[PDB]
Ligand SMILES: CNc1nc2cc3c(=O)[nH]c(N)nc3c(CCN)c2[nH]1
Ligand SMILES: CNc1nc2cc3c(=O)[nH]c(N)nc3c(CCN)c2[nH]1
Ligand SMILES: [Zn+2]
């Protein structure tokens with residue numbers, strides 16, 4: 204395969220379906236990336252992640268630089284070998300996570316923070332992602348808190364665009380990385396159209412393999428997120444993938460694809476699965492509720508996953524109530540399979556020209 | 572298959588190897604039973620338990636009567652259907668576990684205890700094990716604390732023998748149970764030869780499908796446990812299986828087989844795996860130790876398990892240090908596979924008449 208090739212096979216309105224070909228594999232789009240923040244998709248073996256349909260997983264610069272360490276992982280052969288996932292990996296650049304989880308000192312050079320003193324900069328971020336062996340490298344950005352005033356959003360976006368250029372140059376200076384990995388830029392500008400335009404224009408001038416919509420799913424709500432996507436995605440190059448960072452719930456995914464997004468990542472299926480929340484086509488359910496204690500049905504009536512072929516709601520209820528690890532395993536496998544099935548149904552419906560009908564059917568049932 | 576048939580295929584000294592045939596499957600002996608106290612072998616799917624080589628697992632009357640409840644499990648189709656294990660299940664009778672984990676009131680009728688008020692008696696125990704759908708039912712006993720005076724051990728053993736008769740009669744009165752399940756009696760008498768003889772004689776007079784050595788691995792130490800087995804196992808009927816309850820470490824298993832034991836159960840491989848302890852043929856290792864942080868070798872150099880085929884000590888070190896669920900999963904799978912491999916090597920070496928050499932080789936290396 205090539206280092207990177209995105210091909211759009213079919214379209215419906217703003218929605219697209221296609222493939223990204225990379226050296227370690229093919230990614231079907233629209234794609235959902237399970238999140239593997241500490242070099243594991245929590246409670247799943249990599250073979251189980253792949254069995255559910257995933258083509259690519261997400262890793263995090265921030266968590267892995269802290270534990271077990273980027274240099275350590277490189278000495279051990281890179282992240283793919285370390286965790287036993289041989290397919291593409293996208294790594295976030297840090298910076299969302301620094302601001303989210305760290306003590307911190309921000310400057311034009313980057314950010315210094317407390318987990319032991321650490322530092323991130325465009326150059327260091329790109330180098331960490333190299334040491335991990337990431338296939339899709341994210342530019343190092345600033346994720347603008349919500350709400351933001353226009354002045355603060357603009358200052359923040361402009362810094363991010365200067366860091367996007369530094370990210371580009373750092374990646375390109377590293378031949379092995381430039382020849383084997385891809386680089387995505389991240390659009391900022393909060394909820395403001397003009398700032399989003401300026402950011403899109405800056406990123407396209409630099410040129411990236413893919414373009415993320417950053418700065419959303421940070422407190423604004425679905426209506427606002429959708430309003431911003433409505434004008435923001437069309438600003439990005441049409442022939443490159445569009446990645447909505449940190450989204451989201453099933454209905455957020457459907458709506459975002461209707462607005463031109465091709466890639467997603469979210470901890471919701473893994474995290475909330477461990478907490479007892481199971482996704483179903485009739486909406487989410489909380490398996491800990493007493494109403495499931497003697498329910499012999501599978502978590503979801505249609506789901507093809509191994510969990511729903513073999514175990515009842517009653518059993519999984521028992522396991523989660525008891526805090527058994529197998530409860531976390533089964534819930535997480537089902538929720539990640541559900542998300543992959545949603546992405547398959549989206550892909551197939553766009554390929555067949557019936558995605559708008561699918562989105563309406565989906566919503567009427569999910570919210571019934 | 573028949574309800575129950577034990578056949579001895581080969582012998583070496585006091586050691587035996589053979590099969591127990593039951594309706595739900597064949598059990599190869601000497602056998603190790605992974606423990607599934609809350610209707611799960613912790614952190615493993617039943618298919619993974621079977622892939623490691625297990626033929627039979629252990630369930631507990633005490634835990635399951637509390638959560639999710641014996642009547643509940645019967646209404647849901649029994650324990651095999653509930654947890655997805657279709658092969659034989661042995662259930663302990665409660666009583667070790669009551670004394671261990673419960674508030675309690677003991678009388679000749681049974682025991683009343685605090686988890687909500689609960690009660691166990693020979694009759695109730697056997698009925699719970701029926702409701703669970705156990706294949707091998709344990710008589711309801713009293714596990715004599717260690718150390719015990721001869722008087723207290725004798726009183727306790729005599730009560731247990733009266734409860735063994737009540738257990739027999741309760742099981743036999745229940746036709747479906749008597750026709751499809753097996754019943755094992757449990758020898759008591761602490762460390763005293765004469766009391767062990769009396770107990771063996773009482774149990775054989777009643778007659779059981781198998782005979783457990785109860786009252787050991789409760790603080791006496793390996794030398795003493797082995798001293799007691801030396802005289803106690805020969806007292807039991809030679810043509811029925813001999814089950815050493817709650818044992819144990821790999822070397823305890825080897826020594827006990829040398830003394831005529833055919834079946835074992837222990838939480839050590841599961842529990843200590845979750846705590847970072849991995850079994851290897853060169854002895855146990857604690858994977859959390861810093862010396863493994865960059866060790867690319869598998870947990871054990873010879874082990875055939877899927878964990879050792881795919882992941883390094885360094886990765887598992889990271890996962891356990893981080894408290895990741897996949898760490899518990901991988902450690903537990905390896906430790907249960909190690910135990911099954913030990914039992915296979917024991918079986919094969921007795922079949923080939925070279926078990927005494929195996930036991931010596933094993934020990935020289937394990938303790939090197
Ligand atoms: C859950 N919401 C959320 N919004 C994001 C925005 C950014 C963002 O604007 N930049 C970066 N680098 N990452 C983001 C992430 C993390 C993706 N796993 C976000 N997550
Ligand atoms: C770890 N040591 C230990 N000693 C046991 C003795 C009895 C015993 O004497 N009786 C019964 N019913 N169970 C025992 C158990 C529980 C087996 N999982 C014991 N476990
Ligand atoms: Zn499912």
Ligand SMILES: [Zn+2]
Nearest residue numbers: 874876879905
């Ligand atoms: Zn292994």
